[PDB]
Every structure is written in C-alpha cells, then in structure tokens.
C-alpha cells in the first residue's frame, strides 16, 4: 500500500493515504532515534494538525525511556515567513529550551514550500547541521518542494537568494492532507506538476490535458459530510503526483548541487521568479511559475526552438486548470492592484537568477513538449528576451 | 620550496614565505576561474594587506579576457562582527552589485579567524554555496581556524551556535603576514597549538616546552629597519606550524561532520567556550582554550584517567607562553573588570555544548600528554564537572 521512491540512493519518500495519523510518529521515534523533536508548522495547519500528532506521538514515545520530548513552533503563514528574521526566531527559540535543543534534535516541517524551505534551512544551520523530516501539506510541496533538498528564505531583493542544499531524513507524502486545502492552492500546485510533465513527457502532460475537467470539478465540489473531496478519483490524482514526485527524485539524484540537468526543474522560472519579487505576496509561486512558462515558450519559439503549436498547447493546459497564462490576466489585475511589472524591473530581477553565468542568463529553453533543448538552461541574450517581455 | 598538504582527498593547503606578494592572485586566476572575486577582510588587516594585493591583482587580471572583478568589503575587527548582522550585511552588499555577484563569485577570506568563519559561512549559503579560499592572517588562524572547513556566527547565547560545514577551495599559509602580528595575538594563537601538540604526540609537545623561550623572545623582541621579526628561528616556527596544520588535516580528514574523532579537537573547549561565552570580547579564543585546558586536565586527573604530573606539566608550558592558567589570574581579573563567571553560569553554558548528546555534557579526556582516552568526548557526569569549577 505505502509506495516507496528512493533519491539519492536512499529510500526516503514514503506516499499513501494516512501516513500523519498513524505511521510518522512511530516510523520517526525508530528510524529517527532522539531526545528531542521539533515541530515547525503555521497557524492555518497547525490548529488542525498538530492535536492527533501530540496524541499518536505520546503514545509512542511512552514505550521509550527516557521518553523523548516534542516541542511545536507555530509561525505566521506565508511568503512572509520565509525571511532571515524568521529564521532567527526559530533558531533562538530552539536554544532556549531547557535542556537546550542539541544536535540530535530532529527536526519536523508540517507545512507546504514556505514552511518547508524555512525550516529545512534552520535545520541546516543549527550547530552546522542537525536532521529533518519534511511532511508536505500542500500539492505544490508533495510534488515539488519537499523532494531535492533545496531550502532557502528571500530578501527584499528577490526570491530564494540565501539557502542551503540540505537532504531531509524522510519525506512522508500524505494525500489525505489535501482534503482541506484551499481551491486557489491546489490550483496553484497544478504549475509545478504541469511543468515537471512539459520537461519529461509527451505522455504525462496528455494526460494532464485529459484529467482536467474531472480533477478540477472534484476539486470546486461542495462535499457532503462523510464523502471525501476526491471520492472517485484518488487513483488519478495519487498518480499525477508520483509521476511528478519521481522525476523530480530522477533529477535531484543525477545532479543534487545544479551543475547542469536540475537547472530544468527551473523552466518557467528565471521569468516566473522575476516576476514573483514584484507581485509576492498577493500571487502565489506557481501562479507566477504559469505565466513564466508562457512566456520562456514564446523565447524558445523566438528562438526558432519550439513549435508554436506547442506554445498554445501549453496555454491552453495552463489555463484549462485555472491558472493565469499572461500579466494582464484579470485576477493579476484586481489582486495586484497598484502594482505593474515593467520590462526593465523585470530585467533587472533576472540579474539575480542563480542560474546565470556571471553576466549571462540563462533560460531553460524546451524544443518540444517532454523534450529539453538541452539538459541544461540556455545563454540567452538580453535583447532576445526584451522582444518577448515586450 | 611551497610545502603542500592534502585534506579530504585533495591538495588545497599550500604554505610558504611570500605567497601573498607573489602568487595567491596568479593562482586564483588559474585554479579558481571566476568573473567575480570577493575579497573580505578587517579595517586592521585591509589598509595593510589589499594594496598590493589589487595590483598583483589587476596584473594577472589583465591577462584575461574579459577581464574579472575584485570587490573588497571592509568589516570591524573583533568577535562584535561574528554576528548574524554583519553575516546579513555583507550578502546584501554582494548582491547589490552591479551586476550582482552570482553562483561563480569566489570569495577571499583574508584575517584571522573571526574573519575566516562569517566569511566561510557567507559563502555557504551565499545562493545555496558559492567557493571561498582562507588566507589566514593570524597563528591561530594558519594553524587551526582556517582549515577544516567549519563556519559560524555568534549569539547573545554562546559560541559558534549558528553555522557550516563547508570547506574552502583553497588554504594560503604566508608565514610572512606573522611579521605584523600584535604579541597578545601571537600568544593566542600559540594555545590552539599547545593543544594540538597535547592530543597527537609527547614529542611535538616536548618541542613546544623546549622553544618556548627562544619565540617568546623573538616575538618580544625590539625590530631594527631591515631585520625579520623571527630571523633565526623560521625554521623552528614553520615546523611547529605545520605540524599542527598536517595533523588538523589529518582528523579532519577521518571525521569531517565530527561522528567521533573530531571531538579530540575541542580539547579544552567545553569548558573553555562556557568561560569565552562571559568574559568575550575582552578575553581571547586562545587564552579562553588555556583555562580550558588545565580545568579539563583536572577533571580528567580527578576521574582518575590522568597522572597528576602530566596537569602540572601543561600548565608549566602553558605559563611558559604567556597564557592564563586560571580564571583568577591577574590580567583576566583587570581586562574583565566587573565580570565573574559563576560555577552555575558556566555549568549553563555548558549545556549549550555541540558536542553534547541530549542532556549528557561530552568532555575529550586525556591519558597522557599525547595520548586521548578515547577516539572522541566522554560523557562526564554534572557533578564531577562541578567539582573542577568550585
Ligand atoms: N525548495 C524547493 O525546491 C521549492 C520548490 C518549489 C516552490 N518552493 C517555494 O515554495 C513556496 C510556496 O509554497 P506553498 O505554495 O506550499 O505555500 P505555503 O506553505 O505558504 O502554503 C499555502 C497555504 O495553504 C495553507 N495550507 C497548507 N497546507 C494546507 C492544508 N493541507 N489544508 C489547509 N490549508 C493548508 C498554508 O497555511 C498557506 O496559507 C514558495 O516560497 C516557493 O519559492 C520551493
Ligand atoms: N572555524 C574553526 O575551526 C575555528 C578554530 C579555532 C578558533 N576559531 C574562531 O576564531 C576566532 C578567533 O580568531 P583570531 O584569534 O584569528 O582573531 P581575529 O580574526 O579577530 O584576529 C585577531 C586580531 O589581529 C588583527 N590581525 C589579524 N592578522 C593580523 C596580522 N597579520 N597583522 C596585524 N594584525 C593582524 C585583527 O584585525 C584582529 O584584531 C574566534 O571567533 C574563534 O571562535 C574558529
Ligand atoms: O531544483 C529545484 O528543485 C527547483 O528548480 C527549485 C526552484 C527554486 P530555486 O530557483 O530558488 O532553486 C523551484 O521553484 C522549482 O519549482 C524547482
Ligand atoms: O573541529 C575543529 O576544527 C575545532 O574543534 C572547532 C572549534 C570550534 P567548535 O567547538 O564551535 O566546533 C575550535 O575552537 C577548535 O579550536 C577546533
Ligand atoms: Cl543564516
Ligand atoms: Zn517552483
Ligand atoms: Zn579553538
């Protein structure tokens, strides 16, 4: 039933149904031996999670003597978490616990990316590195997020500009935490797994362009009490996200640091991101990733690289599940009143790509759907992205 | 002539006379190709140290087409800057830049060890890890803090709390930067090699007790216009130097995340970082290492693993040099007038230990001058170490 996927030569992504309410605390208190657990969640999750993780993990712990404590940090939801001053609190919390939390504290990140990649950076600093589990609560984390290592906090500057590559211990994919997630959320998750299928395969991506209709209805569904929101499509769904979750554990394991293939896992990005630094916090990450995506197809298709068919069939994907396939979409409109993306701002946050080479960006540039250029992001000249920016 | 040492499989130590004048630029070029170096250093040091420096520089620099930047950042000598402030300050410089400083920056950290570990840990998570090279300026710093790769920042809470592994592409050790080197910081930096020499081998310790007085004189010693500073004794002091250098390399090497043998090289450290925590910044690294290391002897002899004679020995050679062997010397007393360190202060500090498991304290307990009680830190109980502190 538990299906299993390995990265990095380990065995550390475990994904099914129920994980949280009856397999974590007793998988960590033994694969995970230590005196002292930490929970990181937000507000909106943590009053609806934490209480029957208390109680499961009681009862486990009280088999060990001595008995292993667990201590929850609850921090604000949002990219706005996701800064050096939160950071800071985090770690002076945990050293000012009594005893001190030491370095065989374990370390728990309940969450979606902005917990996720807040957490698992601590986790990497705290007296030079101490382990950590992520349990990913939102679509976007189980299928992007969570898996790879990648952490990070932004500054004003830009997204994700300070980090670490910081491996978690495990990986515990529980689908039955999207029964509450919020519609604007899951459809802001579709992104990544939309890309990760364009990079990969033909295949994938169809049947994402199949599944459309049928996911999203499930998805705006009123739910009577005692049926659940994916009552008869947990079978797709449970499948779009392991396709997604394992090519990306392809990846990460081919080239953990980016020295050439990750750079892929960045498409619809070196646009997306620039654009993220502007609109965050009022549109989301894979709102902005849809619209990056569009617009590096349209380069490559300037570039004489991808058919221009391909383009509308990507915008045509993107928008089948709702999501925003331009700036000038109405939602980006209203959300983001009082505020406009111009094209050198643009250019500007595209200088602080991670994937440039000294003065050079570089853009993942695809030459069919499921088929990259190259397996690596592109040098890309200035003018050629001005013209699609335009 | 350039003595060359490996660590972790590689041969990134290079020391010798003169490397700063006439090689570190040339070679970086080289070996570290990059359109961006970045060099961080101490108000102190720069004014003495860059100026040669941008012109061996731009020399080598010519060569190369186009030609690569170096960008010199100036921070405020002294434990104060190992925050995370200055950490955060000299990232947001870095990426001001115009245009920003990228994934292919290579850093210089040129000064001692304050300079050398919020350096080493900028560089780590600079966009997830960018490479930097140690060009240590202080002894302490050529002969410990600069190889090894461990980074860190303070807090209000105690030492090295918050940092990194992550090792540099490069080690320069010019014995000449010494030439300039204040005696109290000489002196310093002769209590990492004591240590080194008490952990590793009779005979270099021996050497130590043997030389003491001919470098205390040469390092007291009046300079006349034209003369070195250590003019008849280099051979003696590179010696002393690399063989604490080769043997540092050689733990690290064995265990660089610190699993066990690590251990041995925070000697005098749990006590000695409880006590730095207090009296920091009036009192050094070194001489807070030195009380360290004679209420860590004692707490060894008092469990019964260590010869009353070999205490007694390690404090003569330590007060042959200079350095505090109690918290009620007399320099300690006048420098941190209107600070004591109580036993239940420091038994605090203790707590917060990185070599700590759970609550258990771990103490490296020697047998003999030269000769560990075992291959890592012992777990000593509250009140024996409350004993050694009365
Ligand atoms: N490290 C990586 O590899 C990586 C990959 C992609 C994206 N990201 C980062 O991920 C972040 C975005 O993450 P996200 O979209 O998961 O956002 P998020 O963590 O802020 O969660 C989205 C919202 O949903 C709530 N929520 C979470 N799970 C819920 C659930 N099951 N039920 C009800 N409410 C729930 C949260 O409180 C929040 O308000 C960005 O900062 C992005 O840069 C990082
Ligand atoms: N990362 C490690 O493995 C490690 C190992 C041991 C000690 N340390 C850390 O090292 C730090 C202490 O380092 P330090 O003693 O080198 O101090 P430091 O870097 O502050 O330098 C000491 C002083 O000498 C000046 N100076 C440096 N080189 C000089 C030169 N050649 N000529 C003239 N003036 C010079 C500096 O401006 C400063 O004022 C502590 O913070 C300690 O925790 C870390
Ligand atoms: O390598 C990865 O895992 C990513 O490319 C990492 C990026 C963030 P980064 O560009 O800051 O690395 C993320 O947004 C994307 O969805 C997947
Ligand atoms: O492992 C090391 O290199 C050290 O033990 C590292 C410590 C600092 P740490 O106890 O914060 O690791 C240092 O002071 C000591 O001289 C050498
Ligand atoms: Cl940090
Ligand atoms: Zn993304
Ligand atoms: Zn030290």
């Not at 698992?120 to 705290?126: Q, R």
Request: hydrophobic share 40%; charged share 25%; glycine share 8%.
């Amino acid at each position: 039933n538990p299906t299993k996927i390995s990265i990095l030569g380990r065995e550390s992504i475990i994904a099914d149904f129920g994980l949280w309410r009856n397999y974590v605390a007793k998988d960590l208190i033994s694969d995970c031996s230590s005196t002292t657990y930490v929970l990181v969640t937000d507000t909106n999750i943590g009053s609806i999670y934490t209480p029957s993780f208390e109680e499961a993990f009681r009862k486990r712990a009280a088999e060990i003597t001595p008995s292993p404590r667990l201590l929850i940090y609850n921090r604000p939801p949002g990219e706005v978490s996701k800064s050096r001053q939160t950071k800071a609190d985090i770690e002076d919390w945990m050293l000012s616990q009594n005893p001190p939390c030491g370095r065989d504290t374990v370390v728990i990140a309940l969450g979606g990316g902005v917990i996720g990649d807040l957490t698992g950076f601590v986790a990497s600093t705290y007296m030079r590195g101490v382990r950590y589990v992520q349990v990913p609560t939102t679509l976007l984390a189980m299928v992007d997020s969570s898996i790879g290592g990648k952490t990070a906090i932004d500054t004003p500057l830009g997204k994700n500009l300070i980090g670490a590559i910081w491996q978690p211990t495990k990986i515990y994919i529980d689908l039955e935490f999207l029964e509450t997630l919020p519609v604007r959320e899951f459809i802001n998750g579709m992104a990544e797994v939309i890309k990760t299928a364009a990079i990969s395969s033909e295949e994938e991506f169809t049947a994402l362009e199949e599944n459309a209709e049928t996911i999203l209805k499930a998805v705006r569904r009123e739910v009577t009490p005692g049926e659940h929101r994916f009552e008869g499509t947990e079978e797709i769904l449970k499948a779009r996200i392991l396709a997604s979750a394992r090519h990306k554990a392809y990846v990460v394991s081919a080239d953990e640091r980016e020295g050439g293939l990750r750079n892929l896992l960045n498409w619809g990005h070196s646009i997306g991101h620039a654009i993220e630094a502007i609109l965050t916090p009022q549109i989301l990450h894979g709102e902005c990733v849809a619209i990056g995506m569009v617009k590096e197809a349209e380069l490559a298709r300037h570039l004489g690289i991808l058919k221009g068919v391909a383009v509308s069939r990507i915008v045509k994907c993107l928008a089948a599940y709702g999501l925003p396939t331009s700036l000038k979409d109405a939602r980006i409109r209203k959300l983001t009143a009082g505020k406009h993306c111009s094209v050198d701002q643009l250019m500007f946050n595209m200088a602080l790509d991670k994937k440039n080479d000294g003065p050079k960006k570089k853009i993942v540039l695809l030459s069919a759907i499921g088929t990259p250029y190259e397996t690596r992001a592109s040098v890309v000249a200035n003018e050629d992205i001005r013209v699609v920016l335009a």
